[PDB]
Design a protein around this ligand. Structure first.
Ligand code: NAP
Ligand code: NAP
Lengths: 433, 433
């Protein structure tokens, strides 16, 4: 709204800030992609200085010796405030420090909640009363997990949105690849092209695939508390199902396309276990490297976890355009390839034909383009509150059933395509009407 | 029309019969794909016996020792008649020999003109009066060249069709690959699918590609009398342009789809030299094998031939569906890859997007399926007389200009993508309307 932006990294001492946030804002500043008059303010309990953050974070900058002048300028625009996350006087110190900066009264304020959502409720509250800007805009970036089921997510989201309008809430998701936004970009363009063709009439079956060739790799501990449905399917695969099935948006406003996505979601009823095949990856005997270790063989995994590392799920959009048309969401870790495709099978009058859409896995990458979108205010590649609510409604009964019955997942060897029961399930839904 | 078929190989002593016709009918008979009561009658001037043909042709059968019983039966259904191609008594001997066979009076008669078209005028005449069947159907297979320009082709075609109805004339073309019919099959299916999308509105540019990685290889002599336009473009690439641009056929009759193809051709005006880039391949210095030899370095090529071995051409379909939409026909020998694709570029509102259709280069191959089509009477993958006339009309002014002015083709190294002037020409027709 003006020329002066303050980038507040709430929880600047942590892993996400050290390894990712600080490096990518350094890159955006270096490549000249930030607003010229930008200040960076870390905020966290541990008593640090800008020098400490530089010490522990510049290793990840890939800083070359001919970049040292812009790098010194960058850290000259940097500052750090210690404080507690529910302490009034602490947020007072933060707010007045920001007011002290050049044009800071005025300035736009972008809060990055690099914190476990467990503290979100406190932070979003205190910001709301203490640190919001009176002139410039205020935009909060919230991070996964957006809850773990419909109930928890509704609690967290109702809290956040009772304090900020939806054009201030940016739910960010970026851990699946540098090519991650181009996926949705080309699926939007492809929906615009192929709209008149994408019917129940021409299409018999739609499969969306996210295969990764690596395992959990010494971090199965974190993954185990969520599952492959929460990690890849409920958020990403579901959005690209939306982008495939949606109608022509009213325009290219972020909100018309998000309206169409939510209109899609409101016609998918809740997925049930018979339409689901869960799998867990085991070590490769004859392979080598991280392949000799399986999932349970990761030290950080609790003994005997039934957490699925692979899932195949069948959804149905239930309107006049798509009915009895099965949408097959297939994803998993430690597979054969690193594939991220969308196939659409057709009705022949001949073998059987099929259209394929692949991201071969514009120079700003996924997370970089996302931070630039929050700067520009382009909310397109962020999930809206109702979109999130509908996703969680679709998947919560199933996740609850898993957590209750601990259904033993189907084992598959590191490097396999996955359980053959998944191919069984695909073969089963040859609807033919 | 019954159960008894007589396969007459006119000119059975020659290369096409020895190396291809006799082997593939052996394969069709072996795999049980011929009518049960089929007889094979070779006819040619040189005084041979069935034993001689077996001697000189079984080497190409890939006959295994457990196939010798069906092979003996096959040659038991074989017979050979010597005669001249414009000698009345010779065709009398042929006709009465056929009448002597079991049910031969009755029998369907399939004449394969394995002969240089220079004698076609005689053969088709004599057959017409002497050897046609009174009960069964009569079908003639004519072979390339179908003339070399509009005038010669009209002469030969008017002669052939003043004696046979068009549902008796099968113009066969099969020298570009075993996967050659599946190309047109999938392009027909794709036109049926994407019809509502293929407009001037969504598509900005359509390119059709036929790259081969090998040279002429010791046979540049034959190629040199025709050119890459006559070899690949005027016949094959042009038909698949037809299959892309055509309207929805009235049905799946061979003749409704061929009607739509001809309707396409009648709206392409004659290609002119400024929209054409000709190229000729030279030896690869640092490569090896047939790559060290160029085109002129083939001994069978006349010294100093300007014959193009690569051509890039721009056509325009001129109706309401396609207007100012450039169709780029790009083909050539001794290139980098063995690609056979169709690309369709779109109109963005973003880089630039594009749909691709590739034959990855149903168990009966190209030529095998073609002979089975002439048996079944499926004229779909054969060019009709008006289709041929229109193709020749499109390309004859250009070919005449080349033969007159001997324009020195652009040299390109064995293994290259081709002349960069071809990429220039593609870049030039960014129409933008
Ligand atoms: N794939 C994924 O889903 C994924 C991957 C990476 C990160 N994330 C998300 O990124 C966000 C940031 O995570 P992170 O990687 O930066 O980890 P983090 O180190 O746990 O959090 C960063 C900072 O949070 C503060 N903190 C952590 N636990 C706390 C607690 N219980 N009470 C109070 N303060 C606490 C600490 O600051 P002080 O000690 O100075 O107060 C710490 O330096 C989280 O929401 C996480 O879910 C998600
Ligand atoms: N890519 C292509 O375009 C391509 C490739 C291969 C073949 N073809 C076509 O296939 C057809 C058959 O050709 P082919 O490969 O079998 O070659 P071919 O050996 O020239 O012809 C086969 C037989 O034709 C007879 N013959 C040849 N020239 C003659 C002449 N001037 N007068 C009378 N009889 C003559 C001979 O039989 P007798 O001596 O016993 O009478 C010879 O054994 C031709 O139309 C040719 O264009 C096209």
């Amino acid at each position: 709204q003006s020329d002066t932006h303050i980038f507040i990294i709430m929880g600047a001492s942590g892993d996400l800030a050290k390894k990712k946030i600080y490096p990518t804002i350094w890159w955006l500043f270096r490549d000249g992609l930030l607003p010229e008059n930008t200040f960076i303010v870390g905020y966290a309990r541990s008593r640090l200085t800008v020098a400490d953050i530089r010490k522990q974070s510049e290793p990840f900058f890939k800083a070359t010796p001919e970049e040292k002048l812009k790098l010194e300028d960058f850290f000259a625009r940097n500052s750090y405030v210690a404080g507690q996350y529910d302490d009034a006087a602490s947020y007072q110190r933060l707010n007045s420090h920001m007011n002290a900066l050049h044009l800071g009264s005025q300035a736009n304020r972008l809060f990055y909640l690099a914190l476990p959502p467990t503290v979100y409720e406190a932070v979003t509250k205190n910001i709301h009363e203490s640190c919001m800007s009176q002139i410039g805009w205020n935009r909060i970036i919230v991070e996964k997990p957006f809850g773990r089921d419909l109930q928890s997510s509704d609690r967290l989201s109702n809290h956040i949105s009772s304090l900020f309008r939806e054009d201030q809430i940016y739910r960010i998701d970026h851990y699946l690849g540098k090519e991650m936004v181009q996926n949705l970009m080309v699926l939007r363009f492809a929906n615009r092209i192929f709209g008149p063709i994408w019917n129940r009439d021409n299409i018999a079956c739609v499969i969306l695939t996210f295969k990764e060739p690596f395992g959990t790799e010494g971090r199965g501990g974190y993954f185990d508390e969520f599952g492959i449905i929460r990690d890849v399917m409920q958020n990403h695969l579901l959005q690209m199902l939306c982008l495939v099935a949606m109608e022509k948006p009213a325009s290219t406003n972020s909100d018309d396309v998000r309206d169409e996505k939510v209109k899609v979601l409101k016609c998918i009823s809740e997925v049930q276990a018979n339409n689901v095949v869960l799998g867990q990856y085991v070590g490769n005997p004859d392979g080598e490297g991280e392949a000799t270790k399986g999932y349970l063989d990761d030290p950080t995994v609790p003994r005997g976890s039934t957490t699925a590392t692979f899932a195949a799920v069948v959804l149905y959009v239930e309107n006049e355009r798509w009915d009895g048309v099965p949408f097959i969401l297939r994803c998993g870790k430690a597979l054969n390839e690193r594939k991220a495709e969308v196939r659409l099978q057709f009705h022949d009058v001949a073998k059987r034909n099929e259209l394929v859409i692949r991201v071969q896995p514009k120079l700003p990458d996924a997370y970089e383009r996302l931070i630039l979108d929050v700067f520009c205010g382009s909310q397109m590649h962020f999930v809206r509150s109702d979109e999130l609510r509908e996703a969680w409604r679709i998947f919560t009964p199933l996740l609850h059933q898993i957590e209750l019955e601990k259904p033993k997942p189907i084992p598959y060897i590191y490097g396999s395509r996955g359980p053959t029961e998944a191919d069984e399930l695909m073969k089963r839904v040859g609807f033919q009407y």
